[PDB]
């Protein structure tokens, strides 16, 4: 299905007092670089503090590679570098 249609994922930025929840489309055919996906997401969630490094499923599992976006999970929490 990830080969047939771009995946809609929901990213919620941690911290910020009203929590910035965003939907981005990721295409499994065109997303080669995990680092670039992080850079992209940083732009989209308007992360002023530098590029996101840590993202997690709502279960708390850390996302470390592109196949983590294209499995069972469609919602992620992004932790800007200020959180660390």
């Amino acid at each position, epitope marked *: 299905k990830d080969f047939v249609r771009p995946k809609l994922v929901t990213i919620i930025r941690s911290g910020v007092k009203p929590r910035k929840a*965003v939907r981005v489309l990721l295409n499994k055919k065109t997303a080669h670089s995990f680092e670039q996906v992080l850079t*992209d997401i940083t*732009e989209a969630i308007k992360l002023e503090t530098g590029v996101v490094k840590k993202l997690y499923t709502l279960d708390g599992k850390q996302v470390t590679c592109l196949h983590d976006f294209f499995g069972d999970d469609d919602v992620f929490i992004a932790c800007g570098p200020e959180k660390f």
Partner: nanobody
Amino acid sequence: VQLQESGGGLVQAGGSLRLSCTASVNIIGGNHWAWYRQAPGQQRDLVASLSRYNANYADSVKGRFTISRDNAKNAAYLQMNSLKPEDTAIYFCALENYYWGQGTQVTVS
């Protein structure tokens, strides 16, 4: 995901129009945009496409038309300069070649 197009309508030959398309999601750098156009009862033809690293154009429009994007506005644009009567068509924006706009009439007299 919905796309909303605007900016169509009538122009004189030689004039300019700018089409816009706004997506109902937050667009990022990797997202692919394209504009297609269609004559009554014909298939849509590719006009321009824009991936992260390339803008590509049909031979007919290259130089005159420019596809561009503004991710902060979740949008893409088709700047159409030096319009010709053969540019008359309904234009359609597509996102990831999967979501489509409803179609915008452009008429060049």
